[PDB]
Each structure stands twice: as structure tokens, then as C-alpha cells.
Write a protein that binds this ligand. Structure first.
Ligand SMILES: *[B@]([O])([C]N1[C]=C(C2=[C]C(C([N])=O)=[C][C]=[C]2)N=N1)OP([O])([O])=O
Length: 358
């Protein structure tokens, strides 16, 4: 009676479109993939001052969704035998050998359980020497492996170690190896001069234009930029790993493996994992201030569900991201905004749309 493309458009209009007015968001891209059919919805402006409309070429900052590519790079290196998750960083970054940080394994760095790493490096840490000094001077606090504290330095160090293991800088690992293996054409650590015209401005809480600041180990933690079509291709790879070459197939499957529990949230590699079907409140609880900002004692997985779903939020000063996929239903959703909106609104909108689709 109404074509599938129009039904998805109507659901996204009902649930995502009102957030633009509510939070004064200049631009938004919402993608759905179902049964290998991609649906792209674009709203508003990539640049207010240049009057440039959001389109399929628009490049957004992914923020912490960048961690999913770092995790994928880690999975790739492990399954090629370049690293083991039981290894310590000193094995690859020789200047960390026999330092206290060398008592933390790569899996613990990737999944934020060092027991003494905060969300950000200190502001003063900028250069490679300052990053090295920081990790050399690092001392434990909580028992290693027992406490989850969401941390850019933690997965940043994991990223740097993965890069050393593949004998390339981290930016080249993604741009030359991982992005091409996933078939991504417009995904960047460094947006080249020829694509700056497609790079959206972010907008802060006063709707002033801004972009991400350079930082220590930024690329592996929050430094990736992508388009809606690329992020839908990335969700396709996660929904259909069997259709990709062996190396990247095993990489993707590695990122789906739950490592521990924090109540109903299973920490996989980058991805957060949930028993499917999941309640809205289970997905909302995953990004509570308690889980995101504070240390939490982890428990061993005591119930492994047969059927799972996965999501990840991402924010920079000027951009919001949300990606979610459900293997059982062969469906996923990407939301990109050039203004931060509350995580709860991203998760709720996606939940209603993915549960409403026939
Ligand atoms: B990640 O996005 C955690 N997160 C937020 C940021 C960040 C970085 C900047 C910047 N200009 O460097 C500004 C604001 C925020 N880095 N890492 O995960 P979630 O939990 O979705 O915030």
C-alpha cells in the first residue's frame, strides 16, 4: 500500500525529525539497513554559514564510535597473529617494558579495566614524548582487570600497540588496511584538503561552529570521521561478517565477543552487547552517568545469551553519533548529528524505529 522506503522515512520523521527543533540541531543523517537494503534520510545543514545541506557526501565526527574501528583493527591484528590479548604493551612499545603499566594486558586496556585510567589524559599531555612519560610514570590503583572505567587513554594505548604490531602508524592502519577491507571510501582519521568542503561544522551548546581539537592518541579514541553511506556499509559488515574475506571477518567477529558483565551490559571490543530482545531501559542504563563516568566492578559472564544486539554512542564537542545493530532481525541504524543531543534521546528514537519496522 505504501512502499518500504516511505514507511521507514515516516518512522524516522516521527521519531528523529522532532529532535532537530527540540535541541536546535542544524543537521542530521539517519540511516537504516534491513536485509541488505540501505535507506538514507538527510535533514538540515552541514554548515549554517555556508548554507550547505546535509547529504550523502557530508563527513561527520564519530567521536567514541571511532573505538569500534580501533577494536576492529585489534581483532584483525590478533587473528593475523601479530598480537595476543594476553600480551602486555611493553612487548611492542619497548620503552614500557618492565614498567607498572606492563602488568596490564591488551584486552584489559581495550575494555577499560587497568584500574587507574580516567576518561581523558591530563590537558598538559599533547606530544608523543609526553604520552610515553605519562605511561612510564603510571602506577596501579584498583586491582587490575576488576574495575571498568571508560577511558580514552586506555583504548588509545591499545590502538597504539595494535599499530606498532602491524609496523604502521595508527592513521595508516585504518586508512590503508581496515577502511579498505570494510569497503569504506569516505572514512578518515585525517580529512584531506580535497574533502574539507564535505566536512560538516560541529555546533556547541551555544550553536557556535567548532571541530574536534587534536589530542594525545586522539585517532584510536575519538578521531574518525565518516559519511552516512560508509557507516551503513560498516553496519552491513557487522551484520554479515561471512561475506567479507577471512582476515576482516574474524576481526569483526572478535569485536562481537562479550568479555565481562556490568549488570545487563556486556562489554565486547568497542561494542556494548545486550541480550536480545533488550528493553529500552536496559539500553538507556548502559549510558547512565554511573556506567560512563565512574569506576564499576565487573563480573564474569554467568549467562551467555544465544541472541544479542550491539550499540555504541559517540560525542565530540560539536557532534553526536549512535550506531545499533541486531543480527537476528538483520537490521541496524546510524544517527549522525552536528550538535550533541542527550544519549537517551538517540537510544529511544532508534529503539522505536527499529521495533516499529515490519
Ligand atoms: B566518547 O565520545 C567519549 N568521548 C567524548 C570526547 C570528547 C572530545 C572532545 C574533543 N574536542 O577532543 C570534546 C568533547 C568530548 N572524547 N571521548 O564516548 P561517549 O560515551 O559517547 O561520550
Amino acid at each position: 500500500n505504501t512502499p518500504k522506503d516511505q514507511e521507514i522515512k515516516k518512522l524516522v520523521d516521527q521519531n528523529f525529525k522532532p529532535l532537530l527543533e527540540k535541541y536546535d540541531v542544524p543537521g542530521m543523517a539517519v540511516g537504516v539497513i534491513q536485509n541488505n537494503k540501505k535507506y538514507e534520510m538527510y535533514y538540515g545543514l552541514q554548515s549554517v554559514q555556508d548554507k550547505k545541506a546535509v547529504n550523502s557526501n557530508t563527513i561527520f565526527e564519530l567521536g567514541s564510535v571511532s573505538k569500534l574501528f580501533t577494536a576492529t583493527a585489534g581483532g584483525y591484528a590478533k587473528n593475523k597473529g601479530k598480537i595476543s590479548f594476553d600480551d602486555t604493551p611493553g612487548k611492542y612499545w619497548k620503552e614500557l617494558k618492565n614498567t607498572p603499566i606492563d602488568q596490564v594486558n591488551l584486552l584489559q586496556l581495550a575494555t577499560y579495566t587497568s584500574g587507574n585510567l580516567a576518561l581523558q589524559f591530563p590537558d598538559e599531555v599533547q606530544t608523543d614524548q609526553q604520552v610515553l612519560t605519562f605511561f612510564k610514570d603510571w602506577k596501579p590503583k584498583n586491582p587490575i582487570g576488576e574495575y571498568r572505567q571508560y577511558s580514552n587513554p586506555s583504548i588509545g594505548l591499545f590502538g597504539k600497540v595494535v599499530a606498532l604490531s602491524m609496523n604502521k602508524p595508527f592513521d595508516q592502519v585504518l586508512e590503508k588496511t581496515i577502511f579498505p577491507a570494510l569497503g569504506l571510501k569516505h572514512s578518515y582519521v585525517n580529512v584531506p584538503k580535497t574533502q574539507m568542503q564535505n566536512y560538516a561544522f560541529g555546533y556547541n551548546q551555544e550553536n557556535q561552529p567548532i571541530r574536534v581539537n587534536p589530542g594525545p592518541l586522539d585517532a584510536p579514541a575519538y578521531g574518525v570521521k565518516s559519511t552516512l553511506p560508509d557507516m551503513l556499509s560498516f553496519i552491513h559488515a557487522n551484520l554479515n561478517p561471512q561475506k567479507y574475506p577471512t582476515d576482516i571477518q574474524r576481526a569483526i567477529n572478535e569485536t562481537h565477543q562479550g568479555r565481562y558483565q556490568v549488570n545487563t551490559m556486556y562489554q565486547a571490543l568497542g561494542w556494548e552487547e545486550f541480550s536480545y530482545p533488550a528493553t529500552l531501559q536496559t539500553l538507556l542504563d548502559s549510558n547512565s552517568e554511573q556506567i560512563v563516568m565512574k569506576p564499576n566492578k565487573v563480573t564474569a559472564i554467568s549467562k551467555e545469551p544465544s541472541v544479542k544486539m550491539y550499540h555504541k554512542t559517540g560525542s565530540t564537542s560539536g557532534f553526536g553519533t549512535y550506531v545499533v545493530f541486531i543480527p537476528k532481525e538483520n537490521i541496524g541504524l546510524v544517527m549522525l548529528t552536528n550538535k550533541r543531543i542527550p544519549n537517551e534521546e538517540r537510544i529511544k528514537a532508534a529503539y522505536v524505529v527499529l521495533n516499529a519496522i515490519k
